[PDB]
């Protein structure tokens, strides 16, 4: 993975030695070159993973997450260069260095062969994200939101540290390749009960679990646009990646430990979706929709069937692209009206027709329109949870009504109706903004032509 | 109830509004034109029977039971004009009512497609931005202390001056753009 | 009663300005000042070339693979003759004639 | 379709409806013929005249605007304002 780690590190002298008018264009160019090189991870086999070294490997789970991670950095640079145009030059370079450092932590989070190196990178991803939210967020509440984002994660994850070192002492290793072959059945006990909780609650916070999700509609709202893109597109998927690695070690106890959490997600995706019906803050509406979509990934991991893991990784990649595009659209209005209130600027299809087409496509992929990979992941999780219990389709289908209802109401409030009369600074869409929308949406629609690369280790 | 300049509804206004609503709902009930014309004269006779009532409490009571009569005998789907609220063509063209300030956002190569129109627009813009401070100082020298009582705006009390707060009434979009 | 003279004068002045605006919405005859800019071609470009492409795709890439185009076998009647073999299907029994 | 309205056409149609109304003689009538002060018409008659205007031109005048139309010229000018004539 060192062919991806060293170019990401060389982005640091690339961004600190550039000319002052050149520090966006060079980083965008070479991050796009790294994302072009990211397709060499697709050397995946039907039997074996692509095992690079003692430290790094990549199966078909980490590979779409790595391509999405290396693809999201140029899009974050495009999104975050307008509102940081008036910024000091050294602080602008520090912002770009925090995004580069976060990508550098993420690409060896997803490729960590050993689980405590996974933990170290997985918790190293806090510090650039925390600094970005609490330094380049706009409002007052970013300090409090950074505290919530920090201390839900660490309160969930410092038990995970003790649990991983306990597995290290018991099994002798935390190599995932060794633990594929040395995994022992985890019997029913209270010791193994709190073992399961210490392995799972950090990722339950990262997904987020409903009830633990309170950090998210602050940390995804009080952040700048690049922070919201990396949080909702990648950093919610560290939890699903970690669960799909760690439930190997937690059998057969998971088969009854999952029952409360599944309820917390199956009811949670009813509640949070319903919350999106009555949100005034558009960025908070996208945040509670993110909680609603990640509840399905929690259910699909906790029922641990093949169709569920395929649908869960498809839904994670699809939700990454979709929610990142939705945050970028909310920023495209917020750079014009300077308020995140959704009822403020209405009827924007009368003024921005192509941007309203981007809103339409993002909302149709949000409501899981076939044959988008949003619907592929949605539908496969629905199939596997129907095999889990035939009643859950009700809680699925009612969700699939409300998921439609907030996706179009967001379209109806922002883009339709009569426009707001007193707002007259609605500029035409810049080429940068439509470029960002197309670089979100065109990969998302091209993946419908060949979805087997985003279906994970057991396609 | 709710009016821009008046603070209430007089008894005379309530009677006229009830009379018009009763004739409209009656025309909804009485589809054919001769038959509605007959029953409209009968209802006009019913309104003319109590026209000379100088007792205001008796007249207000008759208005009240006439409203009860109306609420009983209304059509469930009354006729509504198409561009009237509740009509089938109401606020249909609001998606075509692009505001005028968006013309300030055009590219010069598409402003040069209509040179006479924008050359004629810039003098409207100049006229408005010279009229603005005159109509602000006209509003503050005519509004009473405590603010304006009603929403009624004054006309231009000089010659050459424009009426205060005139731009969005004059430059409103057409009904059929 | 109706309007007050303040309302009359204001609505008259607004009416005059509105009519001047609507007049100034008109078009000059030189406007729009534009920048300086095979009979059955529809049956060739939208029909015949797509029939060529789709027949090439079905003949040399779809039917070359098994079970991609599965046709129902043709309905066989008494008295038919098989083109591949020449086997005559024998007719039915003579009818117990009803009318 | 949809032929445009002119002030001459709106004036002719408004006076044409008022000439078809039996409480108005057609030779006394002009565009300034006030309904209560010149024609001597009732307020109920003014409401019926505005309803005949609505049934003539095919749109609804609200009552807060209907109760101020007390001459034919104000009716013609209101229809001019709500149909945007002489573009």
């Amino acid at each position: 993975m060192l062919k991806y780690i060293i170019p990401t590190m060389m982005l640091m002298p690339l961004t600190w030695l550039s000319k002052n008018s050149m520090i966006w264009i060079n980083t965008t160019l070479h991050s796009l070159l790294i994302s072009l090189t990211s397709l060499l991870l697709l050397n995946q086999f039907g039997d074996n993973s692509l095992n690079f070294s003692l430290t790094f490997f990549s199966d078909s789970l980490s590979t779409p997450l790595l391509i999405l991670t290396m693809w999201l950095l140029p899009l974050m640079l495009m999104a975050s260069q307008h509102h940081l145009s008036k910024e000091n030059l050294a602080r602008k370079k520090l912002f770009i260095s925090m995004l580069i450092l976060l990508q550098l932590f993420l690409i060896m989070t997803f490729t960590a062969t050993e689980l405590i190196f996974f933990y170290i990178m997985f918790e190293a991803t806090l510090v650039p994200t925390l600094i970005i939210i609490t330094r380049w967020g706009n409002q007052t509440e970013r300090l409090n939101a950074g505290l919530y984002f920090l201390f839900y994660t660490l309160a969930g994850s410092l038990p995970l540290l003790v649990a991983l070192i306990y597995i290290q002492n018991t099994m002798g290793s935390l190599n995932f390749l060794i633990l594929q072959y040395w995994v022992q059945p985890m019997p029913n006990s209270w010791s193994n009960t709190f073992m399961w909780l210490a392995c799972m609650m950090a990722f339950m916070v990262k997904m987020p679990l409903y009830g633990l999700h309170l950090w998210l509609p602050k940390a995804h709202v009080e952040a700048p646009i690049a922070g919201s893109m990396v949080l909702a597109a990648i950093l919610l998927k560290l939890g699903g990646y970690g669960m799909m690695r760690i439930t190997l070690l937690l059998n057969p106890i998971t088969d009854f430990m999952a029952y409360p959490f599944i309820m917390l997600s199956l009811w949670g995706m009813i509640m949070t979706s319903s919350i999106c019906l009555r949100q005034t803050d558009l960025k908070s509406l996208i945040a509670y929709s993110s909680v609603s979509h990640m509840a399905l990934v929690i259910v699909a991991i906790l029922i641990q069937t093949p169709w569920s893991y395929m649908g869960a990784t498809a839904l994670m990649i699809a939700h990454g692209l979709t929610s990142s595009m939705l945050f970028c659209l909310a920023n495209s209005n917020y750079e014009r009206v300077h308020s995140r209130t959704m009822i403020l600027a209405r009827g924007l299809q009368t003024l921005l027709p192509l941007m309203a087409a981007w809103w339409l496509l993002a909302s149709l992929t949000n409501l899981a329109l076939p044959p988008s990979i949003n619907l592929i992941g949605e539908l496969f999780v629905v199939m596997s949870t129907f095999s889990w219990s035939n009643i859950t389709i009700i809680l699925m289908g009612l969700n699939m009504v409300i998921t439609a209802l907030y996706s179009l109401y967001m379209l109806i409030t922002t883009q339709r109706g009569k426009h707001t009369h007193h707002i007259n600074n609605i500029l035409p869409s810049f080429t940068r903004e439509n470029a960002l929308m197309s670089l979100h949406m065109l990969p998302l629609l091209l993946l419908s032509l060949n979805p087997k690369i985003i279906l994970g280790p057991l396609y | 109830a709710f009016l821009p300049s008046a603070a209430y509804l007089t008894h005379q206004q309530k009677v006229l509004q009830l009379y018009k609503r009763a004739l409209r709902h009656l025309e909804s009930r009485c589809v054919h034109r001769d038959k509605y014309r007959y029953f409209a004269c009968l209802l006009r006779a019913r309104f003319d029977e109590h026209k000379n009532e100088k007792d205001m409490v008796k007249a207000t009571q008759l208005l009240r039971e006439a409203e009860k009569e109306f609420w009983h005998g209304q059509h469930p789907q009354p006729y509504i004009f198409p561009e009237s609220p509740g009509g089938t063509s109401y606020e249909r063209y609001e998606c075509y009512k692009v505001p005028e300030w968006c013309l300030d956002d055009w590219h010069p190569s598409e402003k040069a497609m209509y040179p006479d129109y924008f050359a004629k627009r810039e003098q409207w813009k100049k006229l408005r931005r010279e009229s603005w401070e005159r109509e602000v100082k006209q509003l503050q020298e005519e509004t009473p202390v405590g603010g304006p009582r009603t929403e009624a705006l004054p006309p231009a009390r000089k010659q050459g001056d424009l009426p205060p707060l005139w731009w969005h009434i004059v430059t409103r979009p057409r009904e059929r753009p | 009663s109706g309007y007050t003279p303040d309302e009359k004068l204001r609505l008259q002045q607004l009416r005059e300005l509105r009519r001047r605006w609507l007049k100034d919405q008109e078009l000059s005859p030189r406007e729009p000042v534009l920048p300086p800019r095979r009979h059955s071609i529809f049956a060739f470009t939208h029909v015949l070339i797509p029939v060529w492409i789709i027949h090439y795709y079905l003949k040399y890439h779809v039917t070359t693979k098994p079970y991609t185009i599965v046709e129902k076998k043709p309905r066989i009647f008494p008295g038919d003759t098989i083109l591949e073999t020449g086997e005559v299907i024998p007719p039915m029994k003579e009818f117990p004639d009803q009318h | 379709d949809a032929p445009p309205l002119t002030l001459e056409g709106i004036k002719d149609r408004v006076l044409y409806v008022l000439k078809l109304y039996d409480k108005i003689d057609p030779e006394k009538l002009s565009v300034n013929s006030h309904f209560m002060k010149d024609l001597g018409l009732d307020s109920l008659d003014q409401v019926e005249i505005i309803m005949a205007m609505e049934d003539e031109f095919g749109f609804e005048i609200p009552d807060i605007d209907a109760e101020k139309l007390m001459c034919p010229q104000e009716i013609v000018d209101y229809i001019a304002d709500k149909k945007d004539v002489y573009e």
Binding site: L351, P353, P428 | E110 | - | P4, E87
Partner: peptide, 13 residues
């Protein structure tokens, strides 16, 4: 004749 201007947003960009 009597061709009227159509106010529309900037379709250039």
């Amino acid at each position: 004749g009597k061709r009227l201007f159509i106010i529309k947003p900037s379709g250039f960009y």
